[PDB]
Design a protein around this ligand. Structure first.
Ligand SMILES: C[C@@]1(c2cc(NC(=O)c3ccc(C#N)cn3)ccc2F)C[C@H](C(F)(F)F)OC(N)=N1
Ligand code: NA
Ligand code: NA
Length: 370
């Protein structure tokens, strides 16, 4: 409890390609790099020699593999994968000293799923059974870990924007953040769904019915890059950031993530974004504040950055954009998610990402969409 030195720095990544942890499956152990995705609930690994993959799961080499005789077909807006369901033994070498029998979906066909040039070969869906595919009886990796071992029912993520970071499984490591953690309730255990109760651009309120911030849900999702906002909130949000910084002009396509923008070797013009989240106590909220350093993402394989806030029709998505400013504690045993200022967040001399409270916010339960 409090000190997990072996788990510190166990995530790697390339900017734009996500964060992965090293995992082993089968006996003898097969080492795979696996994408950490708090917005899905399947443990799904390449199992066939797709050209983009460094390595894949070879079930034939595993004496402990058990076939479930059941296929799965998983489409996404862009992307699909199909595979064969089975169970095998799984450990995390830079995670707790335990081995579990987990469901694995061996991906045998995929389209637009794997990234050419990336160093991961599968995805670790850390959310709940309710969105597992094919259905909610396929118990996710984390539920099996907690059922079969003494690991507490929580994990925390420090995503440092070559990227790196830490996934602490079973606890919190205090060296990873400063100040205090503040907690928002998980509204329903499917996605890691939370409730946003107010949004401020450079300390001015968007002044929207708060139901708009969570239409139709808000989630914390390490497997998406952007801060994604409901169309109507997105519209209000760029309008406000345009006005805050209109000392310089940008092509309009920039704000739609349709073209990049460039200086040489200009942060003080861009405002901070505050999201207030529902607190633990009636009428109490807290707020997280992100810097332009989080929402203007550097692009290499071209000083050119992309606007990393985008419109959505699936609700607000607090992606890696947001998470990279914070230590984020997925406190599943108490159905709550904690934020604190990350000890590794990208910043400067003028302002810093922040987590502040308490605030008085009334009618917070109205902000949820039904
Ligand atoms: C199951 C899914 C998924 C994520 C990724 N993620 C990445 O490729 C990636 C890339 C960059 C970064 C960063 N930073 C993070 N993740 C790739 C494939 C995929 F199917 C798709 C699902 C969706 F809603 F999209 F369907 O969103 C989430 N949460 N996970
Ligand atoms: Na247990
Ligand atoms: Na600390």
């Amino acid at each position: 409890r409090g000190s997990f030195v072996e788990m510190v720095d166990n995530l790697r990544g390339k900017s734009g390609q996500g964060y992965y942890v090293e995992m082993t499956v089968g006996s003898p152990p097969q080492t795979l790099n696996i994408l950490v995705d708090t917005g899905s609930s399947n443990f799904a690994v390449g199992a066939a020699p797709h050209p983009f993959l460094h390595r894949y799961y070879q079930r034939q080499l595993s004496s402990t593999y058990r076939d479930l005789r059941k296929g799965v077909y998983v489409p996404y807006t862009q992307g699909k994968w199909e595979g064969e369901l089975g169970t095998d033994l799984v450990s995390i070498p830079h995670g707790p000293n335990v081995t579990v029998r987990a469901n694995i979906a061996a991906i045998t066909e995929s389209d637009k799923f794997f990234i050419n040039g990336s160093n991961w070969e599968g995805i670790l869906g850390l959310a709940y059974a309710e969105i597992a595919r094919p259905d909610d009886s396929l118990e996710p990796f984390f539920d099996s870990l907690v059922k079969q071992t003494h690991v507490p029912n929580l994990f925390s993520l420090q995503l440092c924007g070559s990227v790196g970071g830490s996934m602490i499984i079973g606890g919190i490591d205090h060296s990873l953040y400063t100040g205090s953690l503040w907690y928002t309730p998980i509204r329903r255990e499917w996605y890691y769904e939370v409730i946003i109760v107010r949004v401020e651009i450079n300390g001015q309120d968007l002044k929207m019915d708060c139901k708009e911030y969570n239409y139709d849900k808000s989630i914390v999702d390490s497997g998406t890059t952007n801060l994604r906002l409901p169309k109507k909130v997105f519209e209000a949000a760029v309008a406000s950031i345009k006005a805050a910084s209109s000392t310089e002009k940008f092509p309009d396509g920039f704000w739609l993530g349709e073209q990049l923008v460039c200086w040489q070797a200009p942060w003080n013009i861009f405002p901070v974004i505050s999201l207030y989240l529902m607190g633990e106590v009636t009428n109490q909220s807290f707020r997280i504040t992100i810097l332009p350093q989080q929402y203007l993402r550097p692009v290499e394989d071209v000083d050119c950055y992309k606007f990393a806030i985008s419109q959505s029709s699936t609700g607000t998505v607090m992606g890696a954009v947001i998470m990279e400013g914070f230590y984020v504690v997925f406190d599943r045993a108490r159905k709550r998610i904690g934020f604190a200022v990350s000890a590794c967040h990208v910043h400067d001399e003028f302002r810093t990402a922040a987590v502040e409270g308490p605030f008085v916010t009334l009618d917070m339960e109205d902000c949820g969409y039904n």
